[PDB]
Paper text:
Notably, we obtained a structure of a fully glycosylated Sing/16 at 3.9 Å-resolution. We also solved the cryo-EM structure of Sing/16 produced in GnTI- cells, at 3.7Å-resolution and Sing/16 produced in HEK293T, at 3.9 Å-resolution. We observe density for core N-acetylglucosamine (GlcNac) moieties in our cryo-EM reconstructions at all PNGS on both HK/68 and Sing/16 except at N122, which is within a well-resolved region of the protein, and N8, which is near the N-terminus and is part of a poorly ordered region of the protein. Of the PNGS that are shared between the two strains, the largest change occurred at N165, which went from 20% high-mannose on HK/68 to 70% on Sing/16, in line with previous results describing a progressive increase in glycan-mediated occlusion of the HA surface, particularly within the immunogenic globular head associated with the emergency of high-mannose glycans positions N165 and N24627. In addition to the changes in the shielded surface area, we also observed an increase in average inter-glycan and glycan-protein contacts of glycans on the head domain of Sing/16 compared to the same glycans present on HK/68, which is a result of increased local crowding and glycan-glycan interactions. The HA plasmids contain either one or two N-terminal superfolder green fluorescent protein (sfGFP) domains, for HK/68 and Sing/16, respectively.
Hemagglutinin (HA), the most abundant glycoprotein on the surface of influenza viruses, serves as the primary antigenic target for neutralizing antibodies. HA is a trimeric glycoprotein with each monomer composed of a globular head containing a vestigial esterase subdomain in its lower portion, and a stem domain17. Each subunit consists of a membrane-distal polypeptide (HA1) and a membrane-proximal polypeptide (HA2). The HA1 subunit is comprised of a globular domain (residues 116–261) formed by an eight-stranded antiparallel β-sheet motif that includes a distal shallow pocket corresponding to the receptor-binding site, surrounded by the five immunodominant epitopes (A-E).
Residue numbers in the entry:
A (entry chain C), B (entry chain B), C (entry chain A): 25 to 516
Amino acid sequence: ATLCLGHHAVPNGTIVKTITNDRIEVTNATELVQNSSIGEICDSPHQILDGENCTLIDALLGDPQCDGFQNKKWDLFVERSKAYSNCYPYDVPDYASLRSLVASSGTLEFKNESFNWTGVTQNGTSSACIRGSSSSFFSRLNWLTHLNYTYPALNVTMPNKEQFDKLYIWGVHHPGTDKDQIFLYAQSSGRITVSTKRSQQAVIPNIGSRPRIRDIPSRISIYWTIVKPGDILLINSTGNLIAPRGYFKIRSGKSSIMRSDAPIGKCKSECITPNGSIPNDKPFQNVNRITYGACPRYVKHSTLKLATGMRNVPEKQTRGIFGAIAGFIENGWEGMVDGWYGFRHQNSEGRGQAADLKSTQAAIDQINGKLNRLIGKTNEKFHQIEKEFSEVEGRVQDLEKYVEDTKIDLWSYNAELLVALENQHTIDLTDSEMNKLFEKTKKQLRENAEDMGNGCFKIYHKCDNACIESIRNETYDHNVYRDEALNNRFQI
Amino acid sequence: ATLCLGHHAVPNGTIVKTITNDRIEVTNATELVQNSSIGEICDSPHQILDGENCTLIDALLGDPQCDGFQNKKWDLFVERSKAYSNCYPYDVPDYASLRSLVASSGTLEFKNESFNWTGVTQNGTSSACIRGSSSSFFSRLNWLTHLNYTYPALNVTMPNKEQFDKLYIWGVHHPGTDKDQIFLYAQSSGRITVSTKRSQQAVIPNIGSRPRIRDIPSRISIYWTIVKPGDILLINSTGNLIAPRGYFKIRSGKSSIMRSDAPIGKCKSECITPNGSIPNDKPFQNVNRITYGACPRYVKHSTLKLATGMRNVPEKQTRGIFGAIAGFIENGWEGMVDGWYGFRHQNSEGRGQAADLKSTQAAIDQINGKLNRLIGKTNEKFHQIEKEFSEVEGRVQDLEKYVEDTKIDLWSYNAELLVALENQHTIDLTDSEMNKLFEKTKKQLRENAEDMGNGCFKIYHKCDNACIESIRNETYDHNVYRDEALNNRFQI
Amino acid sequence: ATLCLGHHAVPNGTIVKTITNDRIEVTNATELVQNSSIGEICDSPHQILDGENCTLIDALLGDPQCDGFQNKKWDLFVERSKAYSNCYPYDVPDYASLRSLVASSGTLEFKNESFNWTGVTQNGTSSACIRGSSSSFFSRLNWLTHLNYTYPALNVTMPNKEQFDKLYIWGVHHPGTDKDQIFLYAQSSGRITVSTKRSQQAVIPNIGSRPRIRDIPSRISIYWTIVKPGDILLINSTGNLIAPRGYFKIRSGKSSIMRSDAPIGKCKSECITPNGSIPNDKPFQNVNRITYGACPRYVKHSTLKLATGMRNVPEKQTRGIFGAIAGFIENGWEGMVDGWYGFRHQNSEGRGQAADLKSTQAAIDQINGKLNRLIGKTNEKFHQIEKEFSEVEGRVQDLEKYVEDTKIDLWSYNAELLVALENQHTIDLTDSEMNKLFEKTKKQLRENAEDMGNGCFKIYHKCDNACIESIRNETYDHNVYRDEALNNRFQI
């Protein structure tokens, strides 16, 4: 009789990369790079705040347009490119740091405080910042002006006797004329100094016309102070002070901000990009280097195929290290669809085929053990650094860019090497399981059969279907057939 | 006779991770993550300076409390959380950069210089800074005041004609009243400008009361200049100048600073953390991301087990690639305690067991070669970046945090992959050595024995203890027994 | 007859590192670290601009010495250590950021603009900046002075109505005396404020003598503004303004700057270091961490040898996992120079040797597949961060240094692990190909030969040269000789 060992093959193989070859065909493979988004930022499970027409800073200051954002919290604040300011013209020195610390804090929770502004006119107001069809101002800021043509020197204190840090936002007004300076504050100069036990911020206003923003040549420069428990805010002003009305609560947590024009969708996804939410089943992604949540790692490769099956073809230069698959076994069997390894036989009762379940399962379990290491195990990242920039800044920006490029190149290397190593090992382990099955079958047959060199055994006795079945299921008694087999082997 | 090949096993195995399995038991394993400190910073072999009640900046300025730190050097300066300043109230713009450059320099070596302060009163003194029960000041700073109610415009020069850089520390006094400004300096304003060939630092004092620190509403702002050889320091002051008394030597080397409340111990250890000194035998550590010296690399894993022995069990899905261990050899032998591989026999004279030394050693040497790559080869790091922060700063701090998080995640990946790869290879190499021993034994026996399929050979002749011994030690002559063996094999 | 399987060896082996051994000899190996430069910066294929005696900033401002650099472009600007400024003394706040953004832009393209300087004297000039033997000034800057002893308040505007960004360079003059201030500008103070819609830069000059640079105690402080399309530059000055004569075009691209004293050579090389251009065939380099172009990655190792051949020696502790090379095959054959694996025979007609081409090629193809992954696949880097520093700066510099050290250590790890893994696999794959050839030969011979245990087969029949040739080329019919062979094997 004849008993042949073999493995399965498929008509639709997949090309993968290995350590020793750029292009080898395997029976099956899975993609490890996520390359697509559905185009929507899912509203679950992270608390999304669409900024819509407002930036985070405008919502913080209290632009009238952003009145509905009062005391809001978020996991992720989404800034739109269409956003525009429509209150008094302002600048923030170190705007990026203020935007970052508020975004990381994740709250616009504001508590009003009763400051003693004796001797000055409160609630100053402008036609550049109209609220409910009336001239107004930033909701969190108090513009102070002269009362009875006098602005006395202010020396106003507020202690932090709480158990949490207080974030104070205040500003300095720069009029476009000496005339407006006199009209507003009486005083010719003006000067603002705010202090804590640990800090001093001293600002001297600059009178002068700047290019008009929405017809306004004057500006407000915005500053912030953090006052910890047991510390005290102290505000000296001889004019030009845009006063705080209280403090923001500042928290620490997982909160962040992202620039994106993707719509908010009614859906659930853990990983957010500016292109929209992405699946996180895969370990790597090519969609965006800017991410929030439990996200695949950004890599530069567009595709990385992990082999999830054996080799599909013979090829000498990538043949497994044991030399069975693509080796002494000439080809796989497309007609074996119930297992990865198996037996074909020819006897007196005909020709048959049967899969080996134990070797098939042993190969599958090893491949699944690789998949369990790589699939569905992404790591959470929240507030990070900015990675896209609208203006030239030089040295700090060069550093932020370099850090991200360095990180991406290292992760792109890790991903490439991982796939090449795993694929080489997957091809070698599947070759190994075939070789083990052949060796086990050979030992079983003892002196009753000879290797024909092609994965087939010439069995030197009469072996019916039950006899072939006994070999396949490990119950073959060689002693039963040994005399018949030895006579047939050793003759003339 | 019967001769069986086998391997050792133990009752107390250890679970490790591989490429293809999350949980596999091996005979032995070693821990690669250091997770503990003894709680003391060892005083050897690095030169430790305990700052005790003083910060590095207070010791630099010459707070009276820190007079014993004059001209000290260190490899590592240790700042305590209990530390407090008890001289005149001061701030430093870019305090972190000054603290860093002094810490990296590693010396408080100070050389006095004779500045020409003609026309002003020297050695100004305060009740806020008492030394030996007398009102005093910072030991390295010279407070200048009016003489005869006049403060002439100063224009004082000092050349660097040395061969080393000079670090000058100076300050600006901000009085809390215009009255104190007049009393001290005569002049209503005051102004300080210090220059080199390459730099200018122009400071305008700010008169005004700040929140009181130890009853003092006024402040001194501290600045520094570095003057290189062939350059010149030039100091213009029309008042408010806190003058230097000389320069600090500035060096480059391995020096650093660390925040820690761990006691200094009388001991010797190369790696220092804020939690105390740690062993550096292991390649990785989980104790602290802040380190100094020849230290294991910080990783996020709490444990990483490297297999140092073979597989302890049979398991089909992780059976070695050669298929002997956990394969056709059903189980290991707990009663073999003199070697990792060996022989068991049954003959006419009884049953015995003996270890194979050459295969045992070949496996051990390979595992030791892995250990030699990983154990006791840590790399020295000294002055780095700060990694814990007491205040919100925004953009720069976001970057410093991101750089460290990026580095830790990459090293944590390297450590995880290394263990999984090495463990897979260790299991495969130990399976290989077993297979090689079996194959070598098979070839030795020629036609005188048959494989029974379980790692045992049925020897078809009479083989006494000396005959079994000859097989084990490679002196078996097959030709001697061939006729006897062939007759027994090939019969009816 | 006797047929022996074997492999080649060489007299001049090369030591490599593996996973399990520090020192193993292989037949051949290639170097993966580039350690040398030819000492010249090649002028091709990147556009080189030698700055010679000029810095990039001096060429930008228009030092007379740098007049030949007007409107130049470059891929790489080369600054020399011999470079020196010979116009009016200047400083740049954030000099490093300005130098960086211009270097990255890669162009000195300048367009003159007609500013309305009504009421002031234009084209101010100095003996500190002589051009063609006449007193002059920076070519891109316009020094404004009083006209008729009056300096009216300037309020000068320039819109960007183009489609590209404009880079404006301007300055502030600080006279060394109040007298020179009056002589030049009439006004006692002077003040400069330049604004856009988005920015304000307000500079107050500081009257005062600094240490003389080439006999000059006064200074010009340089500032820059970028004005985007639809934005407007606005310049207010009441004195001391060093005016722009137009704008620089600003671009984005692959341009950079490098400090180097290496000569420019007439040659072609893609990778530039400060030490000179380097070959980029190798994946790693030890020459410099500062690079430009398609460059090998900087690593700390001086040498890394990748094995490109099999093991050259027997050694038990690193013997391949199949146990043929350095195993049951006692040694290689130095006399086999036509292939890596082969046959030696002894028969009735003599003794011979012949190489196996198919196994030799299979090993070579796998090794070449590794080489194709590592050789000639370097990645392009252009403008990065600075990595060498001439002055102490503290925190930002600590961060830039830490980022680079972190990156180098990670790449140095990747390179070390790659070589150790590849070399282990190369030794194992070459052992595998030897084992496959032996196993294939064994199956071919069937019952006509016996393994002697040393890679040699005892063939139990008369096998002439044509019979040996038939075995080597896969046409051996075992059935022809089986009766003769069985009689000789199984006798007394």
